[PDB]
Design an enzyme around this catalytic site. Structure first.
Site, PDB file in Angstrom:
ATOM      1  N   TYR A   8      -2.932  -2.300  10.188  1.00 52.91           N
ATOM      2  CA  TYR A   8      -2.899  -2.602   8.684  1.00 52.91           C
ATOM      3  C   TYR A   8      -1.733  -1.836   8.058  1.00 52.91           C
ATOM      4  O   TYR A   8      -1.000  -2.764   7.334  1.00 52.91           O
ATOM      5  CB  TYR A   8      -3.991  -1.768   8.209  1.00 52.91           C
ATOM      6  CG  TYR A   8      -4.261  -1.418   6.640  1.00 52.91           C
ATOM      7  CD1 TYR A   8      -3.691  -0.354   6.109  1.00 52.91           C
ATOM      8  CD2 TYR A   8      -4.858  -2.802   5.867  1.00 52.91           C
ATOM      9  CE1 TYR A   8      -3.638  -0.174   4.623  1.00 52.91           C
ATOM     10  CE2 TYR A   8      -4.863  -2.419   4.364  1.00 52.91           C
ATOM     11  CZ  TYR A   8      -4.302  -1.456   3.848  1.00 52.91           C
ATOM     12  OH  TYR A   8      -4.172  -1.032   2.398  1.00 52.91           O
ATOM     13  N   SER A  40       1.068  -1.227  -0.021  1.00 52.35           N
ATOM     14  CA  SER A  40      -0.066  -0.046   0.072  1.00 52.35           C
ATOM     15  C   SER A  40       0.727   1.347   0.094  1.00 52.35           C
ATOM     16  O   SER A  40       2.107   1.016   0.436  1.00 52.35           O
ATOM     17  CB  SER A  40      -0.846   0.049   1.298  1.00 52.35           C
ATOM     18  OG  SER A  40      -1.653   1.476   1.509  1.00 52.35           O
TER      19      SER A  40
END
Lengths: 255, 250, 251, 250
Positions: D151, D138
């Site tokens: 996360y 990400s």
């Protein structure tokens, strides 16, 4: 120098290698030190050598009960926490095909969940004593990988990203969060390898060559980076990675 | 009073103001002999005078091969060696590739990147003979996490960051460590000038810590990389930016 | 045949040889009108002649503001718009800060970094009028993972990577994406010459994949970034280096 | 036809990025295994593709499901050419508020799922001439955000793991890369919205391009890295984030 005078500092992995040298250097700089280690005798030994301004306590940083207990004992003794160094951690050899799933999980639980758990219980205490400084231990391998240590290398990139996120999560609380990225450091892990080698000095030469400076780093050298980041010399540094790696991650000097 | 540079000979370029001044002063407080080198001779002399007999000031445009070599020659005639070189001379401008004049583009490249090249071209032969030493360049958080409308400046900082790694690999065998400091936005008389004439809140808001840094805080990172406390660090960038480059907190 | 750039007008600098030539050819195969710009006039025209009527070759020293402006004027005279600019003009030299002559340092910075600034200075006002476009710079894996004894070259490549991010931020509002490709060691006639088999082997060893890249491999990354297949990418560095910058596989 | 007759496994293939990837791979000629924790979702996507795909329920944190997924693939089609690791999820909170179990669950799916799928896929690729593994990291692995802490930690692990794997398996002709998407519009967002307009505008503002990305946009990056157009790329992170991690444009 008295850079941490009367500051209360928890060092996990504090029984040997980097954590030991950090716990000793912090105490030399005036700190009260909690020496936390998965091996209780090692933690006690190092706190005993430091003297009345340290105590040693057994903590498996993967265990929420140990981590919250470590914090209760620290506040019971000194009423606050100014600095937490998350230095508990280990690595193994293998790749995704060969690493047992249990070993993968253990590495992630100690190296990365360890920070999350110790910080979970420390940070509510720092919030009641005007904030503090947290320092994680990542690795040059977070950005410049090595082969055949794959779970360990994955765990180190988690630590680098988590450091940025935590710095963002807690800046408004006066809590700084940074990480040190050591190179290959002479440590008990290497002491054992060498004690079991037919040819220690040759093996060492191989490790030496990972760095452009052509040697391994020492625990004491990393402790200096921990001290810089724990102390008010780095009060405008947060979410940073401070690398001390002999130039192991800066380009391929072997070609 | 720490003496982390006791009797070390340190050249500081851009030593007349802002970070380089705060670095020159801190090094001298730490027992160094300091050469305060600045584009403005009066400014350099003013700081050397302030520090006293352990410092002298010298006018240097770091974009001039002749000034840079002559800086090194005065340094060695005086103290016989160079242990530390701080490349802090540098400037920036507002504009993008469309609006920045070609002359300004070149001048920013000549001072901010070529200055490191020329000071080090003449410093390193001396360091080689005196067992090595430490070279510290000044990059910027923006090398990694850009801002708009300072485009020439930004490009020059990326050059400094990569040049720091290359140099570290070029000179390690000679006992020379090369590293750089990446400051965030640092308060200064330039910022005072604008504040005197939302803006400030907006500068503060660059950093997740929601303020600017000080010249003195960046001087502490300079001192760490110049001193033996960072003996195992080379080719590194040490960022002191209040978290301006770690993600978008806005 | 993919037609990822069909009818798009594309300027490629450094187009007379190596990566810039492979990119000009691949772009034309994908339907583009192509400007082959090169410091060597003959090399640009050769490539443009082989491509045929959808290309022209023009002499350009990207370090010259006059040549860069003239290049853009010729493009818009012929085809009225500019959709893609590939900055691939560039060179390196061996030496360190002590041995590299000042003149060489300046020339590397003027071609490798200033050439981007100048070509884009004249290209961007055109893209601003044709609904934006895509600018692609050439940086290097060494901008991140340095090598010894190429220091001016390595400094220039870090300027290009930082500049790419700044430019993407400067021009996003105009619909102009700015990205760069970071190649590994790419086989070329320079390497044919300097080669005997041991030395190829040392260059191959820079990459965990144990080979050098090709000009064509890099052109595929340039086409990805020039095309609509990458419309959500800007400010990015796309590395295609055989794993030369990901960690030390030789220890 | 970039993936003509290549056998591609796509985890998380029942929604978002994984589904658009599965569909684009099939449009380019691939046999596609649609693997997803939700059987119905996997089947839905496989049905839409047709007879070149099959749907399989897999919880990638389960060694049993992962080895079973690979055995169904080789039993059907005899080989695996491409693995896309896209199963994953995130949660809001910081180290104080995230429950321990959620932290573990995020590490188990996001990072251990890569480890387990590749553990079973790699021995196959090894016998079939190599192949291409693509992970989903990400923009936040690099440019963090606040309040999504487990996360964000998981995605830095995936990026470092990508480099490690590419080094571990280059000698087998296996390339390993990752895509770093920005914020990607999804049904989750359609829900979280319905001030709606303001909320959408804050997520849009993460990118310098001032919009969210689409699943189909990331799928194009998956297809570059799967196909022979990227055969000299390994260990890399390909970012498609609308410039969300390139500096603070706010």
């Amino acid at each position: 120098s008295m850079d941490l005078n009367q500051r209360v500092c928890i060092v996990t992995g504090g029984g040997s290698g980097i954590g030991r040298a950090t716990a000793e250097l912090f105490a030399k700089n005036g700190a009260y030190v909690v020496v936390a280690d998965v091996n209780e005798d090692a933690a006690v030994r190092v706190a005993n050598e430091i003297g009345s301004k340290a105590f040693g306590v057994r903590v498996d940083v993967s265990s929420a009960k140990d981590a919250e207990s470590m914090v209760e004992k620290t506040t019971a003794k000194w009423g606050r926490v100014d600095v937490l160094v998350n230095n508990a951690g280990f690595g193994t050899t293998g790749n995704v095909v060969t690493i047992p799933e249990e070993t993968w999980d253990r590495i992630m639980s100690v190296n990365v969940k360890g920070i999350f758990l110790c910080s979970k219980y420390v940070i509510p205490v720092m919030r009641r004593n005007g904030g503090g400084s947290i320092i994680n231990t990542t690795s040059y391998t977070a950005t410049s990988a090595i082969a055949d240590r794959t779970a360990y290398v994955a765990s180190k990139g988690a630590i680098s990203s988590l450091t940025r996120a935590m710095a963002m999560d807690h800046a408004k609380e006066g809590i700084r969060v940074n990480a040190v990225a050591p190179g290959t450091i002479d440590s008990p892990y290497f002491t054992k390898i060498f004690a079991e080698a037919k040819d220690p000095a040759k093996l060492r030469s191989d490790f030496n060559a990972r760095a452009v400076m052509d040697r391994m780093g020492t625990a004491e050298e990393i402790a200096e980076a921990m001290l810089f980041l724990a102390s008010d010399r780095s009060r405008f540094a947060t979410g940073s990675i401070l690398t001390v790696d002999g130039g192991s991650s800066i380009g391929n000097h072997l070609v």
